[PDB]
Design a protein around this ligand. Structure first.
Ligand SMILES: [Cl-]
Ligand SMILES: [Cl-]
Ligand SMILES: [Cl-]
Ligand SMILES: [Cl-]
Ligand SMILES: [Cl-]
Ligand SMILES: [Cl-]
Ligand SMILES: [Cl-]
Ligand SMILES: [Cl-]
Ligand SMILES: [Cl-]
Ligand SMILES: [Cl-]
Ligand SMILES: [Cl-]
Ligand SMILES: [Cl-]
Ligand SMILES: [Cl-]
Ligand SMILES: [Cl-]
Ligand SMILES: [Cl-]
Ligand SMILES: [Cl-]
Ligand SMILES: [Cl-]
Ligand SMILES: [Cl-]
Ligand SMILES: [Cl-]
Ligand SMILES: [Cl-]
Ligand SMILES: [Cl-]
Ligand SMILES: [Cl-]
Ligand SMILES: [Cl-]
Ligand SMILES: [Cl-]
Ligand SMILES: [Cl-]
Ligand SMILES: [Cl-]
Ligand SMILES: [Cl-]
Ligand SMILES: [Cl-]
Ligand SMILES: [Cl-]
Ligand SMILES: [Cl-]
Ligand SMILES: [Cl-]
Ligand SMILES: [Cl-]
Ligand SMILES: [Cl-]
Ligand SMILES: [Cl-]
Ligand SMILES: [Cl-]
Ligand SMILES: [Cl-]
Ligand SMILES: [Cl-]
Ligand SMILES: [Cl-]
Ligand SMILES: [Cl-]
Ligand SMILES: [Cl-]
Ligand SMILES: [Cl-]
Ligand SMILES: [Cl-]
Ligand SMILES: [Cl-]
Ligand SMILES: [Cl-]
Ligand SMILES: [Cl-]
Ligand SMILES: [Cl-]
Ligand SMILES: [Cl-]
Ligand SMILES: [Cl-]
Ligand SMILES: [Cl-]
Ligand SMILES: [Fe+3]
Ligand SMILES: [Fe+3]
Ligand SMILES: [Fe+3]
Ligand SMILES: [Fe+3]
Ligand SMILES: [Fe+3]
Ligand SMILES: [Fe+3]
Ligand SMILES: [Fe+3]
Ligand SMILES: [Fe+3]
Ligand SMILES: [Fe+3]
Ligand SMILES: [Fe+3]
Ligand SMILES: [Fe+3]
Ligand SMILES: [Fe+3]
Ligand SMILES: [Fe+3]
Ligand SMILES: [Fe+3]
Ligand SMILES: [Fe+3]
Ligand SMILES: [Fe+3]
Ligand SMILES: [Fe+3]
Ligand SMILES: [Fe+3]
Ligand SMILES: [Mg+2]
Ligand SMILES: [Mg+2]
Ligand SMILES: [Mg+2]
Ligand SMILES: [Mg+2]
Ligand SMILES: [Mg+2]
Ligand SMILES: [Mg+2]
Ligand SMILES: [Mg+2]
Ligand SMILES: [Mg+2]
Ligand SMILES: [Mg+2]
Ligand SMILES: [Mg+2]
Ligand SMILES: [Mg+2]
Ligand SMILES: [Mg+2]
Lengths: 172, 172, 172, 172
């Protein structure tokens, strides 16, 4: 047993390792999306910038969980980072919809993690999740919802003009 | 009788209390409108900001009337603030139209108040209304009219693109 | 269903709407108290300033709950804001006592809201209440208790000198 | 007839001369009050300072009316400035009460002047009175009322301690 370990259940340790993988996966999805918009036949530079920033944020989320694992005396175990589900993301609207779906999936995982921490009476872990993850997720989901709504109302994906103008005035 | 009271008719005192309630009501209408535009399925952040600012201005209008009541030796009597007539405001154009209607209604009340002050030969109260309320109302009505016109000419409410672009270039 | 909604119970949504109304009510109580102290026959300007600031803080509390409702994909439903229970607040001490009672009532509502969020396993909502409301309430209640104690010990409400000196040295 | 005179009734001209005298009288009352508080057997230096400032303000009120008379092509006619009604002002509270009475008397004269200007359809003179005199009077009366209230509640005039503390914390 680690000399620092206290009130840290083996199930919580394993769930933290699973969350690390999921955050890295989310980073990869956003990386793929970003460079799709950098294609010469797509060419929406602020969509590209927005998703690259989201990708880098997800990496920060993963690294903080790795730090947490060590803080509590757990041991990090890494797994393959699966490639994203799509190579071609179709449109700005479709990418935003996939991002919304991704963020809700990551949120569900975080909520399950919190439920586990609650069941194991781990208030430090509960606080960690609430303070650093849960509101960030709520804000990210709300922002993506707002973006999807605007793109739909503007006439995307059929209107290339709508995506162009959204790229300039919301993401730029 | 208040030691400060002079040339201040009981009817004027009562009319000032009614105006306080109406200004607070206007604040509530704009508060409701503001957060409608903050909904994830509406998502027009500058409409939200514009109406929240209008809401806060209406509260200032109410507070100045409360100050006036005490300055003249009248006594403030408060009533319930009625909820706004709508929960859902439909569109940017529809909210602007409701705001225009509201501002004209508040103006009519102020004009009736001025007529009362005139009938009771209260030049201090006349000056108060003219100096702090009447031109503010005229400017607010003109601005809302301008906004309604632009939204109509741009193709609102059917064009979600029109409302988006107005939000960015006029309200942003 | 809102595209952003996740782990947000209909009961929690309704309870948030009730809390919005209560925060606005508290804003109204403090607004009334403030202008009582602005009366020429009361004339305690720092009591007036203190309660006006408390009123504006309560409005901020309401607006943050409206933001929360939209963040989680709930829908804001507003009700009439009831007038405060008193027109005349009697004395500085009596107003402080009514403020203490009000703040404890609002606290009780927040605790019931937290219990509901706990029962529905909504850790985001629990964190929201704890982080933004519960300690603010504890601090406000403690401050009002301190004020009541000092006014009593100084000889209020019978001593107009006590209220005058408290207004100058604590609230000024 | 003066080359500048237009829409300026002889009655208005005469009433302006009477108001000039009354403003100078008010200046004299406050001058007398001020130095009463400078007596070694009274010795309230902030009462003295407050009333001296009020005296100088009244002189400014008179001078602006003299300017107005010439602006409109009327001719200034001056009369004796009567001595104040009291040599000894008794107490801080009594002086404040006399100041309140004085300010209401001057207000009544200004209201009669405004009624005359209205009867003679002189909107320039109406505006002059409203803009430069009427709210100043309302504010002065309210302030004096507030002061009287505080002194009474503190225990003046019997409490020399009350007048001392008021001098330090309100007027200082
Ligand atoms: Cl342990
Ligand atoms: Cl352990
Ligand atoms: Cl274990
Ligand atoms: Cl593991
Ligand atoms: Cl894994
Ligand atoms: Cl693997
Ligand atoms: Cl696999
Ligand atoms: Cl726990
Ligand atoms: Cl967070
Ligand atoms: Cl947000
Ligand atoms: Cl937030
Ligand atoms: Cl957006
Ligand atoms: Cl009168
Ligand atoms: Cl009256
Ligand atoms: Cl009357
Ligand atoms: Cl009334
Ligand atoms: Cl009313
Ligand atoms: Cl009512
Ligand atoms: Cl009713
Ligand atoms: Cl009049
Ligand atoms: Cl105005
Ligand atoms: Cl204008
Ligand atoms: Cl203008
Ligand atoms: Cl416009
Ligand atoms: Cl759910
Ligand atoms: Cl849900
Ligand atoms: Cl539900
Ligand atoms: Cl509800
Ligand atoms: Cl309610
Ligand atoms: Cl209702
Ligand atoms: Cl009811
Ligand atoms: Cl929970
Ligand atoms: Cl808090
Ligand atoms: Cl505290
Ligand atoms: Cl604290
Ligand atoms: Cl205290
Ligand atoms: Cl003291
Ligand atoms: Cl003429
Ligand atoms: Cl003439
Ligand atoms: Cl004439
Ligand atoms: Cl004359
Ligand atoms: Cl004369
Ligand atoms: Cl003479
Ligand atoms: Cl004589
Ligand atoms: Cl006229
Ligand atoms: Cl004025
Ligand atoms: Cl004032
Ligand atoms: Cl004023
Ligand atoms: Cl005072
Ligand atoms: Fe982000
Ligand atoms: Fe960032
Ligand atoms: Fe993440
Ligand atoms: Fe994320
Ligand atoms: Fe907790
Ligand atoms: Fe926390
Ligand atoms: Fe405005
Ligand atoms: Fe403004
Ligand atoms: Fe208004
Ligand atoms: Fe308005
Ligand atoms: Fe506070
Ligand atoms: Fe504050
Ligand atoms: Fe509150
Ligand atoms: Fe509170
Ligand atoms: Fe003055
Ligand atoms: Fe001055
Ligand atoms: Fe004067
Ligand atoms: Fe004066
Ligand atoms: Mg996984
Ligand atoms: Mg594979
Ligand atoms: Mg937080
Ligand atoms: Mg009404
Ligand atoms: Mg109703
Ligand atoms: Mg003006
Ligand atoms: Mg309620
Ligand atoms: Mg009722
Ligand atoms: Mg905290
Ligand atoms: Mg005279
Ligand atoms: Mg004589
Ligand atoms: Mg003015």
């Amino acid at each position: 047993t680690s000399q620092v370990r206290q009130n840290y259940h083996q199930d919580s340790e394993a769930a933290i390792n699973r969350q690390i993988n999921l955050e890295l996966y989310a980073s990869y999805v956003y990386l793929s999306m970003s460079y799709y918009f950098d294609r010469d036949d797509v060419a929406l530079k602020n969509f590209a910038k927005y998703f690259l920033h989201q990708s880098h944020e997800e990496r920060e989320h993963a690294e903080k969980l790795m730090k947490l694992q060590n803080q509590r005396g757990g041991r990090i175990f890494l797994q393959d980072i699966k490639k994203p589900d799509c190579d071609d993301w179709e449109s700005g609207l479709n990418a935003m919809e996939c991002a919304l779906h991704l963020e809700k999936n990551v949120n569900q995982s975080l909520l399950e993690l919190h439920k586990l921490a609650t069941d194991k009476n781990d208030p430090h872990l509960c606080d960690f999740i609430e303070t650093h993850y849960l509101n960030e997720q709520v804000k990210a989901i709300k922002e993506l919802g707002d973006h999807v709504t605007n793109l739909r109302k503007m006439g995307a994906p059929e209107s290339g003009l709508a995506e162009y103008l959204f790229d300039k005035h919301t993401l730029g």
